[PDB]
Amino acid sequence: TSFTRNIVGRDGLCVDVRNGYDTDGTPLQLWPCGTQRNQRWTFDSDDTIRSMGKCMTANGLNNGSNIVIFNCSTAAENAIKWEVPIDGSIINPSSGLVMTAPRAASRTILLLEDNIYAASQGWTVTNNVKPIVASIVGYKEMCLQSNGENNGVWMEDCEATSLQQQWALYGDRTIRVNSTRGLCVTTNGYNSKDLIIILKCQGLPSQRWFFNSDGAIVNPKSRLVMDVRASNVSLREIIIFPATGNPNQQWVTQVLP
Numbered sequence: 001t002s003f004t005r006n007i008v009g010r011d012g013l014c015v016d017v018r019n020g021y022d023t024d025g026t027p028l029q030l031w032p033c034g035t036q037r038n039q040r041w042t043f044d045s046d047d048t049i050r051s052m053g054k055c056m057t058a059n060g061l062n063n064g065s066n067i068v069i070f071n072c073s074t075a076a077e078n079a080i081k082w083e084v085p086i087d088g089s090i091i092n093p094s095s096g097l098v099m100t101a102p103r104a105a106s107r108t109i110l111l112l113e114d115n116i117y118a119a120s121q122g123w124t125v126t127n128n129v130k131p132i133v134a135s136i137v138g139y140k141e142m143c144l145q146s147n148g149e150n151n152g153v154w155m156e157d158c159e160a161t162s163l164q165q166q167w168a169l170y171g172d173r174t175i176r177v178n179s180t181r182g183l184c185v186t187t188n189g190y191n192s193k194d195l196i197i198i199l200k201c202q203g204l205p206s207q208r209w210f211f212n213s214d215g216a217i218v219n220p221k222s223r224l225v226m227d228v229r230a231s232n233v234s235l236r237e238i239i240i241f242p243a244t245g246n247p248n249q250q251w252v253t254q255v256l257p
């Protein structure tokens with residue numbers, strides 16, 4: 001009933017108890033991923049998340065409150081209970097606030113903030129601390145492809161050698177250009193028919209994505225899903241659109257060698 005993993009988030013860095021110190025109150029931060037004990041988090045049935053025998057704890061339950069390690073039996077019960085929604089948030093149920101990395105840099109301190117479904121609020125509980133590299137196959141068994149910064153993504157015939165068909169699926173729930181990992185698949189707005197492009201990763205809600213059980217790729221803020229516009233691949237436009245279950249909204253990842 002307990003199991004232990006790393007927690008990967010913004011820019012692929014991991015949740016780390018600062019300096020590897022275990023004294024009560026030590027803040028959680030981002031740090032490059034590794035096997036050190038202060039990056040190993042044990043998820044217990046009681047909804048606690050523990051490292052070095054102590055609990056992930058809200059040091060306060062307000063917008064901007066720090067998250068720290070603290071003795072599990074002395075901390076407040078409301079402050080040590082967490083849930084892990086399927087869209088990759090880490091939420092403190094009492095406050096409704098979510099774990100947020102406000103900057104990408106190593107040593108950024110993790111805070112509880114209002115949920116805006118930002119990529120800075122996406123996390124992946126996993127033992128694989130490297131991004132998973134895959135082609136994204138969709139409508140007509142075509143592949144989603146990059147075409148440079150500030151340019152639309154679109155469908156092309158899948159080719160094992162096309163580097164612009166290769167995507168790094170990061171722990172912060174961003175979908176990145178594998179060969180240029182500072183660039184993220186981004187919706188150019190939150191309205192139906194807004195275009196999906198590549199832009200510099202900035203931790204925004206427009207850059208957060210979820211692969212759901214219906215084969216959809218969902219943008220949690222807008223609720224809308226990637227869609228090959230009008231089921232017409234020669235338009236070379238992928239948009240966000242309400243989920244219909246239709247073939248032009250169905251996707252699957254295929255891991256690359």
Ligand SMILES: *[C@@H]1O[C@H](CO)[C@@H](O[C@@H]2O[C@H](CO)[C@@H](O)[C@H](O)[C@H]2NC(C)=O)[C@H](O[C@@H]2O[C@@H](C)[C@@H](O)[C@@H](O)[C@@H]2O)[C@H]1NC(C)=O
Nearest residue numbers: 062063064065100102111112113114115116118120203204
């Ligand atoms: C919760 O904390 C967030 C981080 O401090 C607030 O967002 C930040 O607000 C700053 C102004 O106080 C602003 O300069 C920052 O750009 C912004 N950061 C980001 C990335 O959102 C947030 O404030 C709300 O949202 C911002 C964008 C403004 O519209 C504010 O007027 C809002 O109050 C805080 N949320 C709440 C509800 O207090």
Ligand SMILES: *[C@@H]1O[C@H](CO)[C@@H](O[C@@H]2O[C@H](CO)[C@@H](O)[C@H](O)[C@H]2NC(C)=O)[C@H](O[C@@H]2O[C@@H](C)[C@@H](O)[C@@H](O)[C@@H]2O)[C@H]1NC(C)=O
Nearest residue numbers: 022023024050051052053054055069070071072073074075
């Ligand atoms: C969390 O705080 C608890 C209460 O202060 C610690 O338990 C206490 O540890 C004292 C010093 O080690 C010990 O003499 C006390 O009898 C005990 N108090 C209670 C109410 O159990 C606890 O330490 C852990 O649990 C105790 C019982 C021993 O097994 C320690 O060696 C454990 O570390 C604190 N937990 C942690 C992880 O620090």
Ligand SMILES: *[C@@H]1O[C@H](CO)[C@@H](O[C@@H]2O[C@H](CO)[C@@H](O)[C@H](O)[C@H]2NC(C)=O)[C@H](O)[C@H]1NC(C)=O
Nearest residue numbers: 130132133134166168177178179180181256257
């Ligand atoms: C995706 O991009 C990554 C990062 O550039 C590539 O990984 C590098 O691969 C080279 C050659 O195998 C190694 O020297 C490095 O160790 C890798 N870097 C990292 C950070 O992992 C990768 O080859 C690309 N393509 C695929 C399919 O993964």
Ligand SMILES: *[C@@H]1O[C@H](CO)[C@@H](O)[C@H](O)[C@H]1NC(C)=O
Nearest residue numbers: 229230231232233234235236
């Ligand atoms: C698909 O888009 C192309 C290119 O814009 C257009 O010429 C073509 O007629 C479209 N096909 C349909 C069925 O609309």
Ligand SMILES: CO[C@H]1O[C@H](CO)[C@H](O)[C@H](O)[C@H]1O
Nearest residue numbers: 016017018019020031036038
């Ligand atoms: C020098 O490494 C130590 O400090 C850094 C930075 O604080 C991290 O906490 C890391 O996990 C810990 O081993």
Ligand SMILES: CO[C@H]1O[C@H](CO)[C@H](O)[C@H](O)[C@H]1O
Nearest residue numbers: 227228229230231241246248
């Ligand atoms: C009439 O709907 C068709 O076009 C819209 C865009 O106009 C969406 O792409 C939708 O999924 C597709 O079925």
